């Protein structure tokens, strides 16, 4: 009766937040009640009308390539009733002015054209102009906001050295315990136990005294415990808790098993108590509670040394000379905004006096607050290397400036950045909540980004579940209903995917698939649901006739659905692929960097025609993918030079379209050539590369003799070259222009890649350093990328054959 709402959330989240079996403290519960106020703050402040209609707008300028589509400075928009009427409108006109009570909704979508923004600033308009599609809208009644209703003694006095006694270990299946006092990634001090023979139970009952004092312990200090037989098991314990108190008492911590990573810094313990290793520890308990409280100019040559350090990439290491120089001239380093990540690495966190000096420094935020928002720099202070709550907070405040559109660009990476946070109720977690509760699109993707990690990562499911419950308790009854219609479908369809995969090592499989879905369609399944990757799109009834099982090494479910919106322009079905086997969380990350790459090029007035298809990971190596209409594989066309160009002319009806297809190929090919090379996912097979009948080429399957990228003689013949051509010159020109544009955002791409490698996947990250050629000049870099084209031209088909 009363607890029916919590059980409703538990089914949506995929984890029971009310469960307190895998906890040793009230951390998750304190953060649950602490997340009430920021949720209430956004629910009360948000506009009912604007939130219900969720307008997707951008304050960014209109691109140079998109102005070419608007003739005589007036675009055409058609308003529907049975009857339609075309209206010529200026790009600077507001929807109300075109309206001359009634809303302008997109035909066949849940996207609305409202607010004090011009038509050129609407994301749907910029999309229609790109693909060369007519802007079709319908005079609708505004959606009711009532559908979105919401249901309702000092530590610095302790001069004694820190110690912790390791009682023993226990496993049902030579060894020693490695104790570490960690702050981020840096180890303050290390102490190891005597090596005793490895058995079922190994007791020590000995105190491990550290060099660090109680006074010198910082906020967010971790007690890293490691088992070496070499490394086998790991576990962590936050020494200074969420209530600013030094931990006390007996603890039995279940350790995570191995075989660097975001999964190592986790405060959460192993839920598998009947199969994992455990550790018994005791912390010095006291009667009184121990709580934690709250110039001259640089010379010419030394300034040249300091400015050189700030100028280097985020991966370049800081020596003792570098760290001491940055800390001594911290006030001059404070003047430079790019110096902040390198400066906050130069500070001794295991020293009470030094940490206090970092706080009085940070107080003079006069230059940081006034500085231009650098997302690369902002994200830099949110990684594994930064664990001070106050240092991480100065980055989160800069993210507040970021508009809704740009929040969507980095939403996935910001969600993964929570893994690097020492405590649960953090500024970043509170930020993701507020931005998710303000905008329906941000909140929708937030739900799926959180639900993806909960379903797989047991290391962070407890943390992400309390963030999802906090979002879910303010998204409104309308979204809560939609999220259930989505969950019910994705869960029922995940069952069929794993069932069909188990039945295959044909006529039998396709007849059994059509059997399994038919009885599901005429049962408890919803009549309509929202597409997790395209929330504007709404899929209805299953097209059982068009449903099939794909023929590959894995057995995915090719599913087709009729559109729920009857105001849709075409009767075209929605295609969704349910695939098990590959890690879709990796595909999710690469596709996001690809979307960022498109925005990076947009600011530089470039359009490299990338196709970043929809992909949402739902469970254990299982999720959904977008079916790209009128698109096939390169290997499918082969099942050698003329073969690809002939397919383009065959699928082209008029010469007007084939001359457009060759241009659509030149941009899309060069775009994926640059993108895949930078991220180190360029040496791929024809089966993992696709092309549309419109000429748009795109890379697929990012589930983890050599060549930098794919530029085979079948593609070069489309351009008209054999081992120059007017199209090939256009290709190399845009290849240089696109590569040069990404080098202007090196630190962004370095920090995006570094995070991806830690949350999704040391020497491996070092790849982008050479790929984006750090240290070299713009003219020197031009020759490097042109030489990579020459490697592809010399190799040709040699690499493609080698893939067995
Ligand atoms: C994460 O990888 C994926 C999976 C499916 C799609 N969508 C998709 N739409 C239409 C397709 C298609 N795939 N394929 C594949 C099947 C998988 C195989 O590996 C390659 C060929 C086709 O033959 N047609 C006609 C994408 C864009 C990426």
From Swiss-Prot:
Keywords, in A-Z order: Angiogenesis, ATP-binding, Cell membrane, Chemotaxis, Cytoplasm, Disease variant, Endocytosis, Immunity, Inflammatory response, Kinase, Lipid metabolism, Membrane, Nucleotide-binding, Phosphoprotein, Serine/threonine-protein kinase, Transferase
Location of the region described as Catalytic loop in the Swiss-Prot/TrEMBL record: 680-688
Phenotype for residue 802 to S: In IMD97; loss-of-function variant unable to rescue reduced T-cell activation when expressed in Jurkat PIK3CG-deficient cells
Catalytic activity: a 1,2-diacyl-sn-glycero-3-phospho-(1D-myo-inositol) + ATP = a 1,2-diacyl-sn-glycero-3-phospho-(1D-myo-inositol-3-phosphate) + ADP + H(+); a 1,2-diacyl-sn-glycero-3-phospho-(1D-myo-inositol-4,5-bisphosphate) + ATP = a 1,2-diacyl-sn-glycero-3-phospho-(1D-myo-inositol-3,4,5-trisphosphate) + ADP + H(+); a 1,2-diacyl-sn-glycero-3-phospho-(1D-myo-inositol 4-phosphate) + ATP = a 1,2-diacyl-sn-glycero-3-phospho-(1D-myo-inositol-3,4-bisphosphate) + ADP + H(+); L-seryl-[protein] + ATP = O-phospho-L-seryl-[protein] + ADP + H(+)
InterPro entries associated with the record: ARM-type_fold, C2_domain_sf, Kinase-like_dom_sf, PI3/4_kinase_cat_dom, PI3/4_kinase_cat_sf, PI3/4_kinase_CS, PI3K-type_C2_dom, PI3K_ABD
Occurrences of domain C2 PI3K-type (ranges): 158-284
Residue ranges constituting the PIK helical domain according to the UniProt record: 295-474
Alphabetical list of PANTHER family matching this protein: PHOSPHATIDYLINOSITOL 4,5-BISPHOSPHATE 3-KINASE CATALYTIC SUBUNIT GAMMA ISOFORM, PHOSPHATIDYLINOSITOL KINASE
Family under the similarity heading: Belongs to the PI3/PI4-kinase family.
Protein's UniProt name: Phosphatidylinositol 4,5-bisphosphate 3-kinase catalytic subunit gamma isoform
Organism lineage: Eukaryota, Metazoa, Chordata, Craniata, Vertebrata
């Amino acid at each position: 009766e009363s607890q029916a709402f919590q059980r409703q959330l538990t089914a949506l989240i995929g984890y029971d937040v009310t469960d307190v079996s895998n906890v040793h403290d009230d951390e998750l519960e304190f953060t649950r009640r602490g997340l009430v106020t920021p949720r209430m703050a956004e629910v009360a402040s948000r506009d009912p009308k604007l939130y219900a209609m969720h307008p997707w707008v951008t304050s960014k300028p209109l691109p140079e390539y998109l102005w070419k589509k608007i003739a005589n400075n007036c675009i055409f928009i058609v308003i529907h009733r049975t009857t339609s009427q075309t209206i010529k409108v200026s790009p600077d006109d507001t929807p109300g002015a075109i309206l001359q009570d009634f809303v302008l909704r997109v035909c066949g979508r849940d996207e609305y054209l409202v607010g004090e923004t011009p038509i050129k600033n609407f994301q749907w308009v910029r999309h229609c102009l790109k693909n060369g599609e007519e802007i079709h809208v319908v005079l609708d009644t505004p959606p009711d906001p009532a559908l979105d209703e919401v249901r309702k003694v000092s530590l610095w006095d302790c001069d004694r050295k820190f110690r912790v006694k390791i009682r023993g270990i226990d496993i049902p299946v030579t060894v020693f315990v490695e104790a570490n006092i960690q702050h981020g990634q840096q180890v303050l001090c290390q102490r190891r136990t005597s090596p005793k023979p490895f058995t079922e139970e190994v007791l020590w009952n000995v105190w491990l005294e550290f060099s660090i004092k109680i006074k010198d312990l910082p906020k967010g200090a971790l007690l890293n415990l490691q088992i070496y037989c070499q490394l086998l098991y790991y576990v962590n314990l936050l020494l200074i808790d969420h209530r600013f108190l030094l931990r006390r008492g007996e603890y039995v911590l279940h350790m995570w098993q191995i075989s660097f990573n975001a999964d190592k810094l986790t405060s959460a313990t192993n839920p598998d108590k009947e199969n994992s290793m455990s550790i018994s520890i005791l912390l010095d308990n006291y009667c009184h509670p121990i709580a934690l409280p709250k110039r001259a100019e640089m010379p010419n040559q030394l300034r040249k040394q300091l400015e050189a350090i700030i100028a280097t990439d985020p991966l370049n290491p800081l020596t003792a000379e570098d760290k001491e120089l940055l800390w001594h001239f911290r006030y001059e380093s404070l003047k430079h905004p790019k110096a902040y990540p390198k400066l906050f690495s130069s500070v001794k966190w295991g020293q009470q006096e030094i940490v206090a000096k970092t706080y009085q420094l940070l107080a003079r935020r006069e230059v940081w607050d006034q500085s231009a928002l650098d997302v690369g720099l902002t994200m830099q202070l949110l990684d594994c290397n930064f664990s001070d709550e106050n240092v991480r907070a100065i980055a989160v405040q800069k993210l507040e400036s970021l508009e809704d559109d740009d929040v969507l660009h980095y939403l996935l990476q910001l969600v993964q950045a929570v893994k690097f946070e020492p405590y649960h109720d953090s500024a970043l977690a509170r930020f993701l909540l507020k931005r998710g509760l303000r905008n329906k699109r941000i909140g929708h993707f937030l739900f799926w980004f959180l639900r993806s990690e909960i379903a797989q990562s047991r290391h962070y499911q407890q943390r992400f579940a309390v963030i999802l419950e906090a979002y879910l308790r303010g998204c409104g009854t309308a979204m809560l209903h939609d999220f259930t219609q989505q969950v019910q479908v994705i869960e029922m369809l995940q069952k069929v995917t794993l069932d069909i995969k188990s039945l295959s090592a044909s006529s039998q499989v396709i007849s059994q698939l059509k059997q399994k879905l038919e009885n599901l369609q005429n049962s408890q399944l919803p009549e309509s649901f929202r597409v997790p990757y395209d929330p504007g799109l709404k899929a209805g009834a299953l097209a059982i006739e068009k449903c099939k099982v794909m023929a590959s090494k894995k057995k995915p479910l090719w599913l087709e659905f009729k559109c729920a919106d009857p105001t849709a322009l075409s009767n075209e079905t929605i295609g969704i692929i349910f695939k098990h086997g590959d890690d879709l969380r990796q595909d999710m990350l690469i596709l996001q960097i690809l979307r960022i790459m498109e925005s990076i090029w947009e600011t530089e007035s470039l359009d490299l025609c990338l196709l970043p298809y929809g992909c949402i990971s739902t469970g254990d190596k299982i999720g959904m993918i977008e079916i790209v209409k009128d698109a096939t594989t390169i290997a499918k066309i082969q099942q050698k030079d003329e073969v690809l160009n002939h397919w383009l002319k065959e699928k082209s009806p008029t010469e007007e379209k084939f001359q457009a297809a060759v241009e659509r190929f030149v941009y899309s090919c060069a775009g994926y050539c640059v993108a895949t090379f930078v991220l180190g996912i360029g040496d791929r097979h024809n089966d993992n590369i696709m092309i549309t009948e419109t000429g748009n080429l795109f890379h697929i399957d990012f589930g983890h003799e050599r060549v930098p990228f794919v530029l085979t003689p079948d593609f070069l013949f489309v351009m008209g070259t054999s081992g120059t051509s007017p199209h090939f010159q256009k290709f190399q020109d845009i290849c240089v222009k696109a590569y040069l544009a990404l080098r202007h955002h090196t630190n962004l791409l370095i920090i995006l890649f570094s995070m991806m490698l830690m949350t999704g996947m040391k020497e491996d990250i070092e790849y982008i350093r050479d790929a984006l050629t750090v240290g070299k000049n713009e003219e020197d870099a031009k020759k490097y990328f042109l030489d990579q084209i020459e490697v592809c031209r010399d190799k040709g088909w040699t690499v493609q054959f080698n893939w067995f």
